[PDB]
Curated annotation (Swiss-Prot), chains B, D, F:
The keyword Cell wall biogenesis/degradation does not apply. Self assembles to form an icosahedral capsid. Most capsids appear to be large particles with an icosahedral symmetry of T=4 and consist of 240 copies of capsid protein, though a fraction forms smaller T=3 particles consisting of 180 capsid proteins. Entering capsids are transported along microtubules to the nucleus. Phosphorylation of the capsid is thought to induce exposure of nuclear localization signal in the C-terminal portion of the capsid protein that allows binding to the nuclear pore complex via the importin (karyopherin-) alpha and beta. This is Capsid protein. The chain holds residues 1 to 147 of 183 of the full protein. The gene is C. Coiled coil: none annotated.
Length: 144, 147, 144, 147, 144, 147
């Protein structure tokens, strides 16, 4: 129905819909990265931040998902439709799950509020026309 | 790798699982009830308890899952394999959801602690064969009143 | 020689023998339970209450039994005795464990005391004829 | 699964192997030793030291083991095997045993701490050249060892 | 076996494995640089920071190593295998010893904690796609 | 250039070296013992004393060294030179390691100060010819008790 996993973290999907998927790196990179960065905490009895809790869902859902996606190519014998599904999956799926994936990470990496900026900010960069906006786009920053 | 979305919720999946599918109410039922219950606060931006959040993810998750389930029969035209997936889905998959799903609901509705407690004890129930264990398995008791 | 495990907690071998095998769920089911609740608490560097140790022992020997048992017939081509080993496995030995096994676990969540009285009152239960025997065998209920 | 029945007293297997398989006496020796020393105790409903348990446990275990070893060829007398396994057993199993088995024993006799110690320091002895070490490694006894 | 020289400095190898060797300049540059920057302190009776202590190990190990590597081309007469070993060495070896080398230096140059950033940060740069991420990558910075 | 990984540890290599190889226990032995001893705290992120750290480096170092030693015989196929390097390695090289290696271990196990002290005195031992110096060279004495 109607529910935005970003709103509770005080956010909006559109803000993201208007910074095309092409951006958010490939799940893997994201995965591997994030993973072995907090693995310990990740598998800890303390959901310090919602992000954490959430995270896994996307993980399972997906992990368990791909774990299934591959199955398709086992108990099924019809390469026409079998090798077709993988498409919509590893593509039109990673979408909502990639940016989001990253998105979340970004917090622990940097911070909730702080994040906002990189969002809107870029929003300006993008929308702002080709000839002016210096290709040197916004990037997840420093400390102060 | 290996992670348990209950590590924080002081419990484990490996455990619950015993649970014969015959236990968890129909997906929709679960969806309805759940939603139908806390509806407002749900779509609210206020993360009261993590449980809430994740749950929501499970939603979109299953959301697109079904939002995709309808996609299966839409673009794919191979009535043989088509129904072979919808099955595994609404079943071999929903399980994990329905399973955990419900549990969550139960939490807020009965309080994280005591909740598992029920689950716990019950454990031995099933881990108990026929002729004995009264067919009156313990039930989600509306939290007993006072002391 | 002559020593009873149930003694360090005041109990005899006959005691449990009042619930002829058939009751005690089988090994697997049992095991899981533990780790399924004390995963870490198990491999925890603390001996909170002996029990654990005991348990762990049964686990060892056992874990070694199942490591040797499976081995019996795979690394040594054997006759009318590669499927006849599993026979004794279950019946006269594993039993003692299953009970003692479960036995502990139980108390580890119900309080050794009450735990005892369970099989106790229950004893008469089973030993008290059917048509008359109460419509419900007392169980390791959270207490109520 | 995985677990070290030594953490129960802040210990790990490894340490063991470091030592020569031979090092530890054969069960028999070991067995009697205690049975003739602490028998009175053990049998009593006092868990004084967790050790007690594990100890006796290993005993049941092995007790069944040997009550099984003799059963290895009770009803059936297989030619090239029946005594080649009762061999392997003591070979790759009684090992894990005796080590701790004894360890345990002496321990209660020489308090946990001191116990650990001895072997520790002893360790290097062996893993240290000839004319650069005492006539032999130090010994057990009570008051002598460090903290 | 299993041990990470970076972990004690609160770090992880992977973080580094995912920023390919090609990055870390040639040992020499690194060496000469680092060397005559703290030489004094380097050969001082005070291991102020572990980095120091560690450092030399890699140094010796390597210094003493190359000191040997060259030997290969002395008491050995077989150019086929002699001139082959140098390969795996000056390449597949400098690896773990270069980034690490630098890595350590980086501290004294900048600082422990501070470092972290340049790591993760870049992690974002890299992973982040070609068309957007401005070639102007992260670089060891300033003071505040 | 010229550096001494002992400058900080208040000592020098040039010194120790006298030490006839016959002194340092086998590499493995050293590895085992060492590891086997402080195992946990070792793989721990907490730098207690620098000694620890460096030591670890020596590990990887030798680690890849051997991790490479196995590489030698794997890809290179010239049985003549092959064994000519493995030798220099496990010997002409291990030396420095075994040498220092052990020393470290000794430190934590006996305390930086007193440790060298032993080493020190010993110095004159070897620097002393036959017929005199009792073949009972001073030994790593478990730190004498009290005053």
């Amino acid at each position: 129905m109607d529910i935005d996993p970003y709103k509770e973290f005080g956010a909006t999907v559109e803000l993201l819909s208007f910074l095309p998927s092409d951006f958010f790196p490939s799940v893997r990179d994201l995965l591997d990265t994030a993973a072995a960065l907090y693995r310990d905490a990740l598998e800890s009895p303390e959901h310090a931040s919602p992000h954490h809790t959430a995270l896994r869902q996307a993980i399972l859902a997906w992990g368990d998902l791909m774990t299934l996606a591959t199955w398709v190519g086992t108990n099924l014998e019809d390469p026409a439709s079998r090798d077709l599904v993988v498409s919509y999956v590893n593509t039109n799926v990673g979408l909502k799950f990639r940016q989001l994936l990253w998105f979340h990470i970004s917090a622990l990496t940097f911070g909730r509020e702080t994040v906002l900026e990189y969002l809107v900010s870029f929003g300006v960069w993008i929308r702002t026309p080709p000839a002016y906006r210096p290709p040197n786009a916004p990037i997840l920053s420093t400390l102060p």
